[PDB]
């Protein structure tokens with residue numbers, strides 16, 4: 106019943122990847138909520154369970170496939186299926202726990218990790234930070250195999266977590282930020298994997314605050330500037346939503362949009 110978007114790393118190109126990310130964004134947002142030309146994800150409050158998740162089916166050159174479940178309210182990867190087993194991150198709360206029971210209902214083995222799925226926790230388990238984990242088509246091809254072999258003991262916990270960190274950034278973060286999609290395009294185009302630089306990391310870390318700053322802005326102007334980093338790690342101040350239009354594709358829902366007057 107939940108929509109499925111397919112992607113394969115086998116023979117992937119900039120175009121096939123772009124088609125994928127565009128389709129993901131299309132299933133995450135409804136078009137009911139756009140502010141400053143930037144789409145907002147569905148409000149969690151009052152969202153019917155039948156509209157809560159989307160599924161991303163990943164296949165690779167090794168002919169393996171796994172299916173990620175994303176929460177439409179935040180684009181968060183909440184768990185995955187590989188064959189006869191499903192694995193879910195430790196839910197943040199009771200309502201989320203009930204919600205995930207609606208996923209992969211006929212899977213014969215259901216597990217809930219004892220740990221959550223945030224970067225901080227995954228980086229601890231992986232023994233590596235995002236800044237030291239290479240991204241690109243190769244890493245994603247490898248991540249898909251790693252997730253597929255987890256149930257049989259073939260994949261060590263550190264490698265599982267590393268693989269999650271790769272999937273989340275190449276799918277969820279790419280969907281959230283055209284900038285990050287663009288970074289992954291580059292790596293795919295030249296088939297050259299590489300770790301995310303500070304421009305990627307700071308955007309990832311700031312998504313929630315950027316969403317709030319935009320939605321709370323006065324006609325687009327931030328009350329308090331947000332500091333990001335450029336590629337070389339130097340500071341870049343954001344004062345206004347305008348500079349983010351080419352950069353951020355989707356925001357998390359924070360406030361209802363105030364009334365909009367025409368002077």
Ligand SMILES: Nc1nc(=O)c2ncc(C(=O)NCC(=O)NCC(=O)O)nc2[nH]1
Nearest residue numbers: 180181182222223224225273277310313
């Ligand atoms: N599983 C998972 N899916 C995601 O899309 C995701 N996307 C982002 C993060 C993440 O830690 N972001 C930074 C952070 O501090 N998050 C918590 C917050 O500030 O609200 N973690 C994720 N984990």
